[model samples]
Target: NESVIESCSNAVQGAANDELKVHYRANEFPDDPVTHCFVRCIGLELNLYDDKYGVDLQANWENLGNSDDADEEFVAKHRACLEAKNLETIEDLCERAYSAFQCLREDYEMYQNELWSHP
Candidate 1:
């Protein structure tokens, strides 16, 4: 799954390799299109996103979710992030994707995936 997710990165649109580390640094994301676009690519690859309004709860809870004990809490935080972003009324695809990743960073304490790991 990790390899397949990494395969989502397309050099033509942005980074040459998996960007979950480099593009999404420990700090807030810089004003870079590559990070946003790269994130959008991964979202599309994993069925977690689309044109602009693809960050659905069921989709996210199912795709990025687990059967472990962290499911409910994770979705709560995930839904919070989605709702928070929605409150801002963002309409750009890449921006929404970036915001989603940023939300993961905001709550990285509960997640162990390298998706929001430090560089």
Candidate 2:
């Protein structure tokens, strides 16, 4: 693996390692701390995530939904997530980053009626 990929893998080794692989294929992440750091290792490696501000949804969302047009209430939930936190530690950073991503993944996947859900 490369640098960030290797580190993120290492971050979740002891705790949610096996279940995490399943979660990855299942379109979700574990609710455990291993998922927390795994989120941080990737997000923090980018310029948009920070130890203080938690995350920049604007930047992170681009990777997850670049080709889609499902843009309703999307910005609000992302803003709400970082705005809801005031963190200053590795502990805080991990959870904050994890929660930020969690908010971004709305249940639009549940509806085939959503014409723009994912393409």
Candidate 3:
């Protein structure tokens, strides 16, 4: 699983973004700016919303962290999920991405429950 293709964020030495700052301010992340930046950048950019209630809206997608890939694919995919403009690739990719995430969560939960009895 570690072989999973990570985003450019994981590839860079110190490529972080804005949201990381916010995370640090709230003591939600480590003090490392570079690392923190990567966290928020990845979280927000990937639609990982932290809902106030029990409804968590964060995403599990890998944040590339590179502006280039962010714009090329991530942004495109984000827009597709949001506005869902006239791009067929955007729509198709988004639909597939959403379904994939859902399947991933479901499969993870199944494994977890099997490993531990339900409380």
Over 4 Å off, model 3: 1-5, 8-29, 50-119
Per-residue alpha-carbon lDDT of candidate 3 for residues 60-107, written as tens digits (9 for 90 to 100): 323222223222343344433433322224333323233323323432
RMSD of 2: 7.1
TM per candidate comes to 0.56, 0.59, 0.24
lDDT of every model, 2 decimals: 0.55, 0.56, 0.33
What's the lDDT of the predicted structure labeled candidate 3?
0.33
Native-referenced Cα lDDT, model 2: 0.56
Q: Lowest summed lDDT over 10 consecutive residues: which window, candidate 1?
A: 110-119
Winner on TM-score (1 vs 3) = 1
- The collision pairs in model 2 are none
Return the candidate ranking by lDDT, descending: 2, 1, 3
Candidate 1 clash pair list:
none
Cα miss at 110, model 2 (Å)? 7.5
In lDDT terms, how accurate is model 1? 0.55
- Per model, how many backbone clashes are there? 0, 0, 3
Displacement of the residue 115 alpha carbon in candidate 1, Å? 20
Please list the residue runs of candidate 1 whose C-alpha ends up more than 4 Å from where it truly belongs after superposition: 17-31, 56-65, 68-73, 106-109, 113-119
